[PDB]
Amino acid sequence: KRAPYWTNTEKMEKRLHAVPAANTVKFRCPAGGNPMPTMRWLKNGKEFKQEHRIGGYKVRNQHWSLIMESVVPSDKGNYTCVVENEYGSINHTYHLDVVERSPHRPILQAGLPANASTVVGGDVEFVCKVYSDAQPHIQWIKHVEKNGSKYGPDGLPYLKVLKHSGINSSNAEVLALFNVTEADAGEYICKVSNYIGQANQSAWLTVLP
């Protein structure tokens, strides 16, 4: 008559588990012991009842598992299993984190970039905070000139990309301008875009003579 003990301790080394919403989670605590130890589940200390999460859950006694279908964010928390027989009891807890993916074009923090002023020769930067689940591609565009003409034959402006995201830039969200020359004055556009869409906001640089 052995008090409860674990079967495959290997499959119980993971304390943290994450999944995007609407997916399925299966928690397990393979146990043995004589007589047959019972299994109980707690959610954040409190007893875990079927009436707790919409659609309850299923327990595979034969597998010592807890199964939650199409987890929702409210399913976030600690899940403690309690195995026991009259001669003793052991437990283990997993921390389930439910993630919610935001598949939209980026959205930028308002007010950034912010307008700036600087004595010719001074320094300045233009920040631009970004929110995007899908990897965002940042690019600082500015209006420039080509052969003394501010515009092209199609009537659209000539644009220059002062800095974009990539392997050479550890931080495209910031754009430092060192030794500001007078010609640096003007509008600095910040355009962030991901495979879904893009967004863009600007600021101004004024160089005091």
Partner: protein, 139 residues
């Protein structure tokens, strides 16, 4: 909970649907660990172009990459076998497809099997759970 939607260069971990953390070890080889500490799962995801990224094993200085043949591998130097096409599937998971190499018309995806084993590009499928990954914040 939002800081996962933040930043240009992003330090993340890629947890496969098969509950593995994609890692790239010093020997160059790509595989998925189940540990939570293996510092070869700390990837450095960066955008090379709209919708296209470069995943880098931050410690073993290796870029996750795919050769025209269809096999995962990590080169120290960044090349076009490193450009991955990142996309969010309808199940909250991400898929990383080769930006260059294709086959039989379909696309080849970065993927781990039942036991952290690097799948063969040609044999992978976008919708097949083998190629799904939950990017995870590291800070």
């Amino acid at each position: 909970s939002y800081n996962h939607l933040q930043g240009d260069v992003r330090w993340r971990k890629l947890f496969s649907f098969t509950k593995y953390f994609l890692k790239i070890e010093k020997n160059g080889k790509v595989s998925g660990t189940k540990k939570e500490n293996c510092p070869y799962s700390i990837l450095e995801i960066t955008s090379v172009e709209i919708g296209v990224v470069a995943v880098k094993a931050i410690n073993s200085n290796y870029y996750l990459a795919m050769n025209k043949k269809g096999k995962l591998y990590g080169s120290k130097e960044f090349n076009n076998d490193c450009k991955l096409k990142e996309r969010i599937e309808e199940n909250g998971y991400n898929t990383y497809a080769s930006f260059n190499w294709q086959h039989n018309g379909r696309q080849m995806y970065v993927a781990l099997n039942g036991k952290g084993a690097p799948r063969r590009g040609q044999k992978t499928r976008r919708k097949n759970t083998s190629a799904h990954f939950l990017p995870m914040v590291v800070h």
